[PDB]
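FAQ: What does a ligand-bound record look like?

Like this one, built around manganese (II) ion:
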Amino acid sequence: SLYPIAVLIDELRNEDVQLRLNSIKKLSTIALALGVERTRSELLPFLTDTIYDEDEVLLALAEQLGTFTTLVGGPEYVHCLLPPLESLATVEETVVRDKAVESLRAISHEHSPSDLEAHFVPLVKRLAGGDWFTSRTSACGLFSVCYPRVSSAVKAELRQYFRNLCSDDTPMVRRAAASKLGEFAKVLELDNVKSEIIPMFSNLASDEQDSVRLLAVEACVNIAQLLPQEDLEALVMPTLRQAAEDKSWRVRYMVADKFTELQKAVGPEITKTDLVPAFQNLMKDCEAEVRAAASHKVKEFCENLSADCRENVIMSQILPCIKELVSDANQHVKSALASVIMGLSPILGKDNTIEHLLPLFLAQLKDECPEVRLNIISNLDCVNEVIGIRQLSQSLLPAIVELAEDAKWRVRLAIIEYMPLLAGQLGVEFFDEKLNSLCMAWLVDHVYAIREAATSNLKKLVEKFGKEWAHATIIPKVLAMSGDPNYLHRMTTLFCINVLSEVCGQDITTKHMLPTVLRMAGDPVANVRFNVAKSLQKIGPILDNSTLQSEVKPILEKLTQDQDVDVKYFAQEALTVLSLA
Amino acid sequence: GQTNRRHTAAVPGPGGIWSVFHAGVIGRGLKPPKFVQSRNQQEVIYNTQSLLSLLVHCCSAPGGTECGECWGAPILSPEAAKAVAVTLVESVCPDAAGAELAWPPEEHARATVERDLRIGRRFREQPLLFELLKLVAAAPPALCYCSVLLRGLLAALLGHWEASRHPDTTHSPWHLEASCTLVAVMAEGSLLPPALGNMHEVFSQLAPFEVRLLLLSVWGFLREHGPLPQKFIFQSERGRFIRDFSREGGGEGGPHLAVLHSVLHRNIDRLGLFSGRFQAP
Amino acid sequence: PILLFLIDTSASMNQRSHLGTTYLDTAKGAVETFMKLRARDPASRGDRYMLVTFEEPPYAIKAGWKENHATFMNELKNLQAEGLTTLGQSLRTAFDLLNLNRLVTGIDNYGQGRNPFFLEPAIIITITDGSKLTTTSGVQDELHLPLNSPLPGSELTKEPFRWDQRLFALVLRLPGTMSVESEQLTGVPLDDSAITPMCEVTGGRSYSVCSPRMLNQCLES
Amino acid sequence: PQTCWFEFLLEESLLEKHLRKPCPDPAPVQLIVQFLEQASKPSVNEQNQVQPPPDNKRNRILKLLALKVAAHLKWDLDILEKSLSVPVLNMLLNELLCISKVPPGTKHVDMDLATLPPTTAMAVLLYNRWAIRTIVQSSFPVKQAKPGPPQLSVMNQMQQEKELTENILKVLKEQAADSILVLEAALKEMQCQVCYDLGAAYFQQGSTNSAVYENAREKFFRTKELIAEIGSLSLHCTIDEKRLAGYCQACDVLVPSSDSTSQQLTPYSQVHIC
Amino acid sequence: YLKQVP
Amino acid sequence: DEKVFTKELDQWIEQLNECKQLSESQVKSLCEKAKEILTKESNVQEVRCPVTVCGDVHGQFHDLMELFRIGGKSPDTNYLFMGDYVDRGYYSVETVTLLVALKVRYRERITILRGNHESRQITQVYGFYDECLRKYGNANVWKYFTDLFDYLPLTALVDGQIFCLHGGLSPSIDTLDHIRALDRLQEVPHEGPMCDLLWSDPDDRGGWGISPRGAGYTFGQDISETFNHANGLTLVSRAHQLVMEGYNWCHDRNVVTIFSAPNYCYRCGNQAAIMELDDTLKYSFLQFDPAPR
Ligand SMILES: [Mn+2]
Ligand SMILES: [Mn+2]
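The answer part, i.e. the structure of the complex:
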């Protein structure tokens, strides 16, 4: 009975931290092996009176108590564990008080209402009266959780305790109390929130510190989601209006970030009458981070309105703000704006997308910054779905040559991936005239991903344009660059063999495809033999039995005892897969 | 033992109106195709035989007595072999940092490791060096002058057996052969006792740390009983220099033979038949 | 105060110790560790660092009054020991710099007595090796400072040095092979060099070093 | 599902379940490591007065659980020697000696084993076998640890542990002479292994005083016919027969015992004897 | 670097 | 046995490339096979041309994936990493696990060197120990990875002409035969040849000097020229300092700094680079940006 306490006290004092962790992570084993009333009687006062100097053990014991409250004997006997769990609140670390408050959240969740009405209310009212701020943070959390199981008089007592604690001067308990206001009204009725919660909410939003106003405005968006359409205009709406244009930029940054749930909560008439002019005030100010957030939110603000008025407000107010935001001297604002600009295209009608968004599209194409270019070129697929390929192709005619040679390979990657649609729409004659050279230079780039994308692009072209065109215009250049001393150029030619052989045909597979593969399997570079083994492995099934048995089998038995072990293994598994022997 | 025309004919494809792929050449290109040396061992062994025959004629004494029933060994002069030893030390290591004939402590081997690696390279490249040591061996005051060479080669072997991770010593042929040949030559030169000098026949079947401990035992013995030019008595009836291991006071190395016997007592499983060679005289 | 380092840049200062490093690199490390140990003292906010090498003028003053700390570091780390052992001219050049600014400021009031409150504290440290003193004509046995009177007013004081400056000498005698015997003397010996009588006259002491531990004791002292 | 030492310290039936658990988590010899490391805590008082650990009930129940764990492995010294260090094994065998009703400081000269209780006789035989094997394996060379600098505290407590190892090995020698007397009195069956280690001792002091080699030979010849009486009954007998073959091959070269066809005829033997 | 992130 | 381990290790590669951590027994087997494959490797491993040499990674796994998207996939292009891929990064265990699994899968295609961060003390103090506790749970996988770092080769040689190592030169090293004679089978000391091998760095000096790091030395153009002349080398490749442009040709076209961790410690904003020696020793630089997140 006392020997567990003795080994606990001689084990908690050492050098390392792993041993106490292994002890208290298995303290539930000690409790279940020893008994129930024993650990109610002596072990709980033992863990109260001891004070440790390390923080992670407090986390582990808190979560162990949270998992242990079931092993205590059920919800009826958990009154023994409440003085220790409230004794854990007098700590100085954030993670351990978070673990403590979530443990007490679980305790409040699992437990039958009558002895919450009897016992937890004095405990939360007494730790609410604690002088330390951590006790008040735990108090406002516990008052946020203890609503639905108490009676009306006990309710009104905890409401007036909440007004007693929420009015104090020190800021961190006001932050915690504002967060618990945001979590608090999610369960209340309409009359109590419309009578006393919202005027003191306005009072707490009327103070000076920025962060209490931050937590106040997301508490405002929660209560706007909660309150019906009939009452929010008269009381909390001027509060959020006067909080919209405050002196600090943090509050307008947050109400920009929270603007979408605000406009979803209030309803379209309030958005048109009040939120739109404040939003023109939002993107047209001097701070630039709020401007980037304003672009990030003008995307999902324009997608979420009513149609018959969204068209008018975008043709009347939004587009001049877009034109002003494009010419902004800050760069990150332009990058974010170009990230979220062509999402307006499926929203907006066709000819208006042309006559407004395409000049700014071509403007954002030629910007010297890379992030704006990579964002707009990634969004070119989304604008490509709603705008027909013909006028988009004619728009990208003088802009396709500068974007195939720019520094960043993301833009080149997306241009290569998008190019088959452009070539298929735009015809074969133009590609044979002055557009094949771009793909030819793409096949010999430095970046591997660019070359692999160009090889898949070759697959798309041989699929979309036909057989004899690829015979006349693609294969001889592939062989001429197969005759290149550099090794990775030979790698790209092997990739061309593989990927163009996916469609290809049957006649060219033995008279201009196979012999070049055969004749260069004796290159001293082991990677050449490695990938010619891979190419033979893949190209096996498309070939017929005569060529597969005439010269493929002797070259594969030639390459299966060479010095490098990797090419030997892939030659062996190529012979295994192709069933050559 | 030990341009532009062909450049411009093959610059198609990657050039044009676009820049070339590379940024430059690191050096002059590939470092040759590397040369493969080829010899035949019969000519090597018989030119070595001719040279050692010439040396053993030159380093012999006058003689010319024709006394007795022959069957005997003519003396090799201890002064000619001293000259051969001096010029061999000159050829291999011209340095004078450790030119003292008394061996320094073991930790001092960690200082001049560059010199030890250089003597190791010299013994590895040319086998004739080892052969010359045997010529220095059969004139017992001579190999004492090569104490620097033996010390450097021993320290290189110590380094190799410290860095060796193989379970068996036959995975490195040359270092095993060099260790056994070295201790055999120092056993020829009356530097080690016959009890301790007969250890190399177990070296082929030990662990690298085990042969390392044996060579440290050798190093400690040469600490305790140095390879001085003196301590050889010129016994005159048949005039030769003899080192008798009775009167130095150590005799057979007590701790050294103890460590060597512990080495045998570990690997009883394989060093069973050869345990009879290390019996006390 | 004013900390001046006279680093010997003769070719004899290019010998290699048992540490696998040259003597000049050991001198640079001595300067660096002197910097660290002086910066440990919470009284060294104002300390002007100067460097003079064994090179003929005007390439003699590496760092002076109008330079800063970064240029002192850059010129310290970029020293090449490719000269002769000309100690007298370098010592005269260092004293000429220091006494030159001294007589510029009027720190020493001639005729009005000697005021030891007017003070410009200065310690100069000559790091050398103790080789033979060499000129372009031959070896010089005994150290003589030149007497050319370049600074106006040098005749009003008999000695080229002054009473506000002190000379110390770090003579590096690191052997090529490490000594088997370990030095256990608490005190640092004096050297039998040609710079020792001069630093005894000027009111300093010549530290003689034979080991890196000895260098640490010398530099702490 | 790992375990800890005080899990078994609080309840004995947990250790009983662990001893019966077919595919365990950390094996019982590392459990011996953990319990005997916990029992090795110095008894520092309130004034930091370091003394021997106290004889409370917790220590005694820890030792009896440890000896029950050791009994689960049938007191087989092979894996128990290979997996546990020297001073910890000294403490374990001292505990096994004192639990067998032996007062400390007793001279080990006679203890007639027929008159002894069977458990006491087997315990003193086991302790003496540990002594003789420990000194023999201390004569063995060891792979030197690679010189990577550890932390200072672990290096210091290793230094203290190997220092106590040196202490226990010297006192091991000066009782080991009398222990050799106890072994040679202990011949008067599965004790052949016992005799085996006796002959191994005669190789440790064989380099000097070569006459003990002759003593050594009959001991190993003894083992051979007892191996002939064993067959495949290697329950407590764990003799490596490669070692026996190598040792007897070493033992043949001190004397000619005739029977050249029966003895070795490899040319190394006749060139050596000639 | 226009990212205060406060 | 070879086929099942090969396909399991390929599935390990595929699971690593999508940024998923492995299990403790899988790391056990990977580390054991890594020990077996790294025992038979010299201190100066000759890597034949062609090879794409990459520099410090320092536990930036998505940047490593981008690096594989630039220089080529690991099956097809040879790689040589000059260590220091374990600390100062959020995803550290995935990076080292990917390198070791690629080494034991492709033994002639991936060459891995040793950095100074790949030691017990430095991993304990600069983050790998903490990452070990937060992901896998106990400190035992750190023990296998420290032993694995212990067996790693120090330097590498490309066509007998390019010397690749992590740090810099040494006052105690004069020939490459002394590199091959060192006992590599030990944790990196505070003083000695190998600590200088993994800790030294070039600077525009005239000789040796105490590095401002607590260990190692610093060397100038004269020392590098002497080392290149006396050993038949022409280039010394290394990866030890942060570089904006990703490559530096210091000591007059003799010492090459190649840093391959863009945006080091996620706050420096450097554009990393790697070197791609072709089959003609006929090089090019691949210079890249950090990955999108
Ligand atoms: Mn790193
Ligand atoms: Mn590094």
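Follow-up question: can I read anything off the structure? Yes, for example: The pocket of manganese (II) ion (ligand 2) is lined by residues F 56, 84, 115-117, 166, 240 (CB under 6 Å).
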